[PDB]
Amino acid sequence: MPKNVVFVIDKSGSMSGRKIQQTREALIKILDDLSPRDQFNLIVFSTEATQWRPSLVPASAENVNKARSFAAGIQALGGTNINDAMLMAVQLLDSSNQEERLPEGSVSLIILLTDGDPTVGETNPRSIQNNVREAVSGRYSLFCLGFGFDVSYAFLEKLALDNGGLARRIHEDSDSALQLQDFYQEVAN
Amino acid sequence: ALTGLSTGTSQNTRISLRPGPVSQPYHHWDTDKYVTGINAISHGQTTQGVGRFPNEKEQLKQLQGLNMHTYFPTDQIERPLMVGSVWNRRALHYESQLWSKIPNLDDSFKTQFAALGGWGLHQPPPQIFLKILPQSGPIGGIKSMGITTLVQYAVGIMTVTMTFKLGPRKATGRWN
Amino acid sequence: QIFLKILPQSGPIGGIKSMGITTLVQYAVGIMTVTMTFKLGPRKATGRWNPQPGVYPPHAAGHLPYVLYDPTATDAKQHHRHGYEKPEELWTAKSRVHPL
Amino acid sequence: TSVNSAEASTGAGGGGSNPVKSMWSEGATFSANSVTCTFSRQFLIPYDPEHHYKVFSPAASKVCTISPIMGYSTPWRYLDFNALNLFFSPLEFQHLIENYGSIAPDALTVTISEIAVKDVTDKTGGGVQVTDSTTGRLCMLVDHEYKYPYVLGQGQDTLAPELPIWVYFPPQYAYLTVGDVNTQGISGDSKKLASEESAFYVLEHSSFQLLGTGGTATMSYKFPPVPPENLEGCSQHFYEM
Amino acid sequence: LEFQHLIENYGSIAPDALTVTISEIAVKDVTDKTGGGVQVTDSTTGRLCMLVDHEYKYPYVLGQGQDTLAPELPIWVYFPPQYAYLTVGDVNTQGISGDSK
Amino acid sequence: TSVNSAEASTGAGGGGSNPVKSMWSEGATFSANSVTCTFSRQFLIPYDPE
Amino acid sequence: TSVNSAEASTGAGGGGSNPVKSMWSEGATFSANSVTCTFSRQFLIPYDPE
Amino acid sequence: TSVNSAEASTGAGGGGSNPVKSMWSEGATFSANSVTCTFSRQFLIPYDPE
Amino acid sequence: LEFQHLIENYGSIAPDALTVTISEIAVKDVTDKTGGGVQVTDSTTGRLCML
């Protein structure tokens, strides 16, 4: 199946060093192996939420190269606004229902990576669980990646379970880029 | 579970009363054996491990040894406070606390010495509270700043001077 | 009224190219200490036999006001206050009363 | 160009100068009728990123306390030096017990000196670097009035380091208060909720000193008259007189 | 607690005197931090302008029930309001629209 | 070379010293005929770029 | 490690302190027989490289 | 975040202040019986590495 | 030269008095330099212990 994949990536100041490098390296390799029929976008979150294209764009040779350059250029931005980040990614996938009705037959997938708990905007985790499930409404699966042990993983597991997906732990080690690739290959096709 | 001297509303809802009154030992060399009280507190352990305890030999000498029975002709370990009682307190030791605050309840009996050692005081050495004054990070024309604090820590030197009053040694009549 | 602003500081002008005109990014902090003296009248003498009404502290919508509490210990519904709560009435004095 | 162009040269940042003299004061001075014991420790007070007051409120449901405890944790640290071995080196304590018949506490002075509030920032090439702050302030509150719950002298693992070569990390100030036991719904488990009697203390509501870098402040205390500890034992059983 | 003590122990209250002290002023320079973000340093040449309008020259905007007060808790940083005020003027019709400024 | 070469060492910038004492003044002092109320707040005035 | 590891924290450079007071002097003071007029401007003198 | 986020703003390092007054002394003062000649030059003494 | 002068001009020598002065103390902070290596700055809070 062609798929509509949205990646939501923490860019908190805690990601500085190996975690940001390994996350970027995994995203470059994931972008490089994307098929020409897929559609995608990238959301970064920190204290501020920022999106690469604000909508789903096709995995053209130009768009994949521009996305890889964006993945290389982005810098860390302090705090952690997980609620806005997820809602923005969800909003971009839900654009399929109205603005872009031609990719409705594609498989939609939302992938979130974080190393920490919410610290900016809505930080009540029960409210965030409500906000995500009411937005997604069972339309697609949410895969939450907990990078490290400095995060409430049970919050990430419950959120993925409520939305047709599963959570996965990424261990802070030398192989974290491979661990991200290994997980993505499970859901890539 | 909570062993030793304790008080509360049930077996499950208790506080420890260790080490118990200063008027009784919780560790001493008995004649061929170290005896340790169920109420004993350890000033750390020799490695959990073997406890580190004062040797309360001056209490053992004056009928205050551990497992001292009193017979009322009937056999019990408890001795009431009697009129005309004499006893030794638990010895001060190198690692003992120096004071504790006597709780300002209405009344008390012989609170001059705290159970953990040192002196009971109604007005003990005052608490000195320290914190770093928080400093705001920048707000203004820079975008996305949020509210932040400056990363600051403090160091310094605490110098503590304590004067102790010292009594003279008692004169010795012994030959040996 | 006490008016405060930071004195603007000019950025560099000179041999460096393309500088334009800029201001130094500066902000100010400090401590505002405000001392206010109030004149206080004495309480009126009470002739009553029966006690005056209690000077009750005011009531909160949940639990108790002005005390930091753990909202997970209480069935109050003011979790959005995170366990520090204002009273729902304004605290007004005038609890004690005297004849006319 | 680069300073590395000279291989035996290092870059220099032109830092400030501060020709202050201060003392490291340590040791016991014995006299016929008293000893004056001084110890010094370096202390460190950490960066606290959010100066929250928190309610300390464990649940209760194996021996529990008689009721569930409740208290408050504050952003303040405090100094704990309530142990005899801080004041005497092992030699000095030997000298005390060898030469004197009794000991009692007489007077206490606490001096905080060489305060440095230190800014932290990112270092070139990663990590952090530290600089002395002229605007940073150390808050010192000395509670001569005993306004605030007294938590010293409880056998807690909070003391100044036993060796003078170790940095004191003063404990976070937190205390327990009375409250009301509230049943946690159907479970029958209990928590102590705050009640009108529960004392919530905000130390920032009092006046305290703001000390800059290089600042010094001193507390002094006199002990009440107390019975001396007898350092000498008995050569007789009282029941064998 | 102090307000409880006031209303428990006294029959009346009136304002008497006020002192405002601004102290521990720091004008802080900001610059880029290594590795991104910003870092702050204390400025010896930065100046905080303080104007106290004892003469009431300037339009008085205090005491209007506005959301401008110092924080209720001592643990919170005051962000003093921007000074702005209303003045008289002439109502001019915005052309054909009949709307007015 | 780098200061990171010692793993338990941090770089130091040699900042300035300022041995000033100041008060955080807070609290109500009551008397028979008056109360003196003091509060302190930290304030921040933002960068205004224009 | 990095100061960015705390998301609500900023690095601090520990700059100097200078508790000087100075006046911005402006305004006309009129009198029966004279006026004293004061104005103040910030000035900037640029870097001259040669 | 960056100080570059405001385009008309520059970073500031909070350097020190030194309100010293000094003279650049130059010129000949002639008199009937003598002249006093003063000149000033800035001098530079280089880094000597050894 | 001074030792030559001593032995040329005097019949005996004995030590009399000593003064040691430590001056111009600088406790110097070290940190990473831009582009690698380290750079040094003078510390106002650093202390030299003299016993």
PDB file of all heavy atoms in Angstrom, chain G residues 20-39:
ATOM      1  N   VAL G  20      26.002  52.450  39.905  1.00  0.00           N
ATOM      2  CA  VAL G  20      26.019  53.895  39.691  1.00  0.00           C
ATOM      3  C   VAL G  20      24.600  54.409  39.475  1.00  0.00           C
ATOM      4  O   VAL G  20      23.760  53.739  38.863  1.00  0.00           O
ATOM      5  CB  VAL G  20      26.936  54.239  38.501  1.00  0.00           C
ATOM      6  CG1 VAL G  20      26.710  55.658  38.016  1.00  0.00           C
ATOM      7  CG2 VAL G  20      28.388  54.057  38.895  1.00  0.00           C
ATOM      8  N   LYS G  21      24.331  55.607  39.988  1.00  0.00           N
ATOM      9  CA  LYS G  21      23.148  56.388  39.648  1.00  0.00           C
ATOM     10  C   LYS G  21      23.545  57.580  38.787  1.00  0.00           C
ATOM     11  O   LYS G  21      24.484  58.307  39.121  1.00  0.00           O
ATOM     12  CB  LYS G  21      22.441  56.878  40.912  1.00  0.00           C
ATOM     13  CG  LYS G  21      21.933  55.775  41.814  1.00  0.00           C
ATOM     14  CD  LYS G  21      21.205  56.353  43.010  1.00  0.00           C
ATOM     15  CE  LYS G  21      20.680  55.263  43.921  1.00  0.00           C
ATOM     16  NZ  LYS G  21      19.833  55.827  45.006  1.00  0.00           N
ATOM     17  N   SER G  22      22.832  57.770  37.678  1.00  0.00           N
ATOM     18  CA  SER G  22      22.985  58.947  36.833  1.00  0.00           C
ATOM     19  C   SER G  22      21.610  59.466  36.439  1.00  0.00           C
ATOM     20  O   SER G  22      20.605  58.765  36.556  1.00  0.00           O
ATOM     21  CB  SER G  22      23.806  58.646  35.575  1.00  0.00           C
ATOM     22  OG  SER G  22      25.155  58.366  35.897  1.00  0.00           O
ATOM     23  N   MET G  23      21.576  60.715  35.983  1.00  0.00           N
ATOM     24  CA  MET G  23      20.339  61.368  35.581  1.00  0.00           C
ATOM     25  C   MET G  23      20.236  61.444  34.065  1.00  0.00           C
ATOM     26  O   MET G  23      21.221  61.717  33.375  1.00  0.00           O
ATOM     27  CB  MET G  23      20.250  62.775  36.173  1.00  0.00           C
ATOM     28  CG  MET G  23      20.093  62.810  37.682  1.00  0.00           C
ATOM     29  SD  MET G  23      18.608  61.971  38.262  1.00  0.00           S
ATOM     30  CE  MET G  23      17.335  62.967  37.496  1.00  0.00           C
ATOM     31  N   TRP G  24      19.034  61.203  33.552  1.00  0.00           N
ATOM     32  CA  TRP G  24      18.592  61.753  32.276  1.00  0.00           C
ATOM     33  C   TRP G  24      17.962  63.118  32.535  1.00  0.00           C
ATOM     34  O   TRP G  24      16.844  63.202  33.051  1.00  0.00           O
ATOM     35  CB  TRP G  24      17.608  60.806  31.601  1.00  0.00           C
ATOM     36  CG  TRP G  24      17.210  61.209  30.218  1.00  0.00           C
ATOM     37  CD1 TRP G  24      16.134  61.964  29.864  1.00  0.00           C
ATOM     38  CD2 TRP G  24      17.861  60.840  28.998  1.00  0.00           C
ATOM     39  NE1 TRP G  24      16.083  62.104  28.500  1.00  0.00           N
ATOM     40  CE2 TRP G  24      17.134  61.423  27.945  1.00  0.00           C
ATOM     41  CE3 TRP G  24      18.993  60.079  28.695  1.00  0.00           C
ATOM     42  CZ2 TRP G  24      17.501  61.271  26.612  1.00  0.00           C
ATOM     43  CZ3 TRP G  24      19.356  59.931  27.372  1.00  0.00           C
ATOM     44  CH2 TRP G  24      18.613  60.524  26.347  1.00  0.00           C
ATOM     45  N   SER G  25      18.677  64.183  32.188  1.00  0.00           N
ATOM     46  CA  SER G  25      18.241  65.547  32.466  1.00  0.00           C
ATOM     47  C   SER G  25      17.580  66.141  31.228  1.00  0.00           C
ATOM     48  O   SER G  25      18.231  66.305  30.192  1.00  0.00           O
ATOM     49  CB  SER G  25      19.418  66.415  32.907  1.00  0.00           C
ATOM     50  OG  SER G  25      20.026  65.895  34.074  1.00  0.00           O
ATOM     51  N   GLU G  26      16.294  66.467  31.343  1.00  0.00           N
ATOM     52  CA  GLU G  26      15.554  67.083  30.251  1.00  0.00           C
ATOM     53  C   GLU G  26      14.476  68.004  30.804  1.00  0.00           C
ATOM     54  O   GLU G  26      13.975  67.805  31.913  1.00  0.00           O
ATOM     55  CB  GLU G  26      14.913  66.045  29.323  1.00  0.00           C
ATOM     56  CG  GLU G  26      15.886  65.347  28.401  1.00  0.00           C
ATOM     57  CD  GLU G  26      15.250  64.935  27.094  1.00  0.00           C
ATOM     58  OE1 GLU G  26      14.313  64.110  27.123  1.00  0.00           O
ATOM     59  OE2 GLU G  26      15.693  65.434  26.039  1.00  0.00           O
ATOM     60  N   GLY G  27      14.133  69.015  30.011  1.00  0.00           N
ATOM     61  CA  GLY G  27      13.060  69.944  30.308  1.00  0.00           C
ATOM     62  C   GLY G  27      13.487  71.392  30.423  1.00  0.00           C
ATOM     63  O   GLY G  27      14.650  71.696  30.698  1.00  0.00           O
ATOM     64  N   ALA G  28      12.537  72.298  30.204  1.00  0.00           N
ATOM     65  CA  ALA G  28      12.705  73.725  30.450  1.00  0.00           C
ATOM     66  C   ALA G  28      12.155  74.097  31.820  1.00  0.00           C
ATOM     67  O   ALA G  28      10.995  73.808  32.125  1.00  0.00           O
ATOM     68  CB  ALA G  28      12.015  74.545  29.361  1.00  0.00           C
ATOM     69  N   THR G  29      12.988  74.721  32.646  1.00  0.00           N
ATOM     70  CA  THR G  29      12.538  75.380  33.867  1.00  0.00           C
ATOM     71  C   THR G  29      12.438  76.878  33.590  1.00  0.00           C
ATOM     72  O   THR G  29      13.456  77.554  33.430  1.00  0.00           O
ATOM     73  CB  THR G  29      13.489  75.097  35.028  1.00  0.00           C
ATOM     74  OG1 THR G  29      13.452  73.702  35.348  1.00  0.00           O
ATOM     75  CG2 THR G  29      13.088  75.902  36.252  1.00  0.00           C
ATOM     76  N   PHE G  30      11.212  77.388  33.537  1.00  0.00           N
ATOM     77  CA  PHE G  30      10.970  78.815  33.376  1.00  0.00           C
ATOM     78  C   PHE G  30      11.035  79.564  34.703  1.00  0.00           C
ATOM     79  O   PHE G  30      10.710  79.031  35.767  1.00  0.00           O
ATOM     80  CB  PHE G  30       9.617  79.062  32.708  1.00  0.00           C
ATOM     81  CG  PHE G  30       9.594  78.727  31.246  1.00  0.00           C
ATOM     82  CD1 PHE G  30       9.199  77.477  30.804  1.00  0.00           C
ATOM     83  CD2 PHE G  30       9.992  79.665  30.310  1.00  0.00           C
ATOM     84  CE1 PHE G  30       9.185  77.178  29.458  1.00  0.00           C
ATOM     85  CE2 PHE G  30       9.973  79.375  28.966  1.00  0.00           C
ATOM     86  CZ  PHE G  30       9.576  78.129  28.538  1.00  0.00           C
ATOM     87  N   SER G  31      11.459  80.822  34.620  1.00  0.00           N
ATOM     88  CA  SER G  31      11.402  81.761  35.729  1.00  0.00           C
ATOM     89  C   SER G  31      10.973  83.114  35.179  1.00  0.00           C
ATOM     90  O   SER G  31      10.823  83.292  33.969  1.00  0.00           O
ATOM     91  CB  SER G  31      12.745  81.854  36.467  1.00  0.00           C
ATOM     92  OG  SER G  31      13.691  82.609  35.733  1.00  0.00           O
ATOM     93  N   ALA G  32      10.747  84.070  36.086  1.00  0.00           N
ATOM     94  CA  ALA G  32      10.299  85.396  35.668  1.00  0.00           C
ATOM     95  C   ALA G  32      11.234  86.017  34.638  1.00  0.00           C
ATOM     96  O   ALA G  32      10.783  86.693  33.708  1.00  0.00           O
ATOM     97  CB  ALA G  32      10.169  86.311  36.884  1.00  0.00           C
ATOM     98  N   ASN G  33      12.539  85.798  34.779  1.00  0.00           N
ATOM     99  CA  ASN G  33      13.522  86.527  33.995  1.00  0.00           C
ATOM    100  C   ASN G  33      14.396  85.627  33.139  1.00  0.00           C
ATOM    101  O   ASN G  33      15.273  86.137  32.432  1.00  0.00           O
ATOM    102  CB  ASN G  33      14.413  87.379  34.909  1.00  0.00           C
ATOM    103  CG  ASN G  33      13.614  88.284  35.820  1.00  0.00           C
ATOM    104  OD1 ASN G  33      12.676  88.952  35.387  1.00  0.00           O
ATOM    105  ND2 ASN G  33      13.984  88.315  37.094  1.00  0.00           N
ATOM    106  N   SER G  34      14.190  84.314  33.177  1.00  0.00           N
ATOM    107  CA  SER G  34      15.025  83.396  32.421  1.00  0.00           C
ATOM    108  C   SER G  34      14.336  82.046  32.322  1.00  0.00           C
ATOM    109  O   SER G  34      13.395  81.749  33.061  1.00  0.00           O
ATOM    110  CB  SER G  34      16.407  83.239  33.064  1.00  0.00           C
ATOM    111  OG  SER G  34      16.303  82.614  34.330  1.00  0.00           O
ATOM    112  N   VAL G  35      14.819  81.231  31.391  1.00  0.00           N
ATOM    113  CA  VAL G  35      14.480  79.817  31.327  1.00  0.00           C
ATOM    114  C   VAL G  35      15.778  79.031  31.246  1.00  0.00           C
ATOM    115  O   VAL G  35      16.714  79.432  30.547  1.00  0.00           O
ATOM    116  CB  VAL G  35      13.548  79.501  30.133  1.00  0.00           C
ATOM    117  CG1 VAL G  35      14.189  79.896  28.806  1.00  0.00           C
ATOM    118  CG2 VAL G  35      13.148  78.034  30.138  1.00  0.00           C
ATOM    119  N   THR G  36      15.847  77.926  31.979  1.00  0.00           N
ATOM    120  CA  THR G  36      16.932  76.968  31.837  1.00  0.00           C
ATOM    121  C   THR G  36      16.422  75.745  31.087  1.00  0.00           C
ATOM    122  O   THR G  36      15.557  75.021  31.587  1.00  0.00           O
ATOM    123  CB  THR G  36      17.483  76.572  33.205  1.00  0.00           C
ATOM    124  OG1 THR G  36      17.944  77.740  33.892  1.00  0.00           O
ATOM    125  CG2 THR G  36      18.634  75.606  33.054  1.00  0.00           C
ATOM    126  N   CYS G  37      16.962  75.517  29.898  1.00  0.00           N
ATOM    127  CA  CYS G  37      16.532  74.433  29.029  1.00  0.00           C
ATOM    128  C   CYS G  37      17.597  73.348  29.022  1.00  0.00           C
ATOM    129  O   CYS G  37      18.761  73.623  28.713  1.00  0.00           O
ATOM    130  CB  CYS G  37      16.290  74.949  27.615  1.00  0.00           C
ATOM    131  SG  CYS G  37      15.054  76.241  27.540  1.00  0.00           S
ATOM    132  N   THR G  38      17.207  72.127  29.367  1.00  0.00           N
ATOM    133  CA  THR G  38      18.108  70.991  29.283  1.00  0.00           C
ATOM    134  C   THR G  38      17.521  69.958  28.335  1.00  0.00           C
ATOM    135  O   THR G  38      16.330  69.644  28.408  1.00  0.00           O
ATOM    136  CB  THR G  38      18.344  70.370  30.662  1.00  0.00           C
ATOM    137  OG1 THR G  38      18.635  71.406  31.606  1.00  0.00           O
ATOM    138  CG2 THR G  38      19.508  69.407  30.618  1.00  0.00           C
ATOM    139  N   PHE G  39      18.353  69.432  27.448  1.00  0.00           N
ATOM    140  CA  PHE G  39      18.023  68.232  26.701  1.00  0.00           C
ATOM    141  C   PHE G  39      19.153  67.223  26.838  1.00  0.00           C
ATOM    142  O   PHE G  39      20.312  67.587  27.044  1.00  0.00           O
ATOM    143  CB  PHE G  39      17.700  68.569  25.228  1.00  0.00           C
ATOM    144  CG  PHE G  39      18.899  68.705  24.334  1.00  0.00           C
ATOM    145  CD1 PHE G  39      19.464  67.602  23.719  1.00  0.00           C
ATOM    146  CD2 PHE G  39      19.453  69.951  24.099  1.00  0.00           C
ATOM    147  CE1 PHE G  39      20.559  67.741  22.893  1.00  0.00           C
ATOM    148  CE2 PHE G  39      20.546  70.093  23.272  1.00  0.00           C
ATOM    149  CZ  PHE G  39      21.098  68.989  22.669  1.00  0.00           C
TER     150      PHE G  39
END
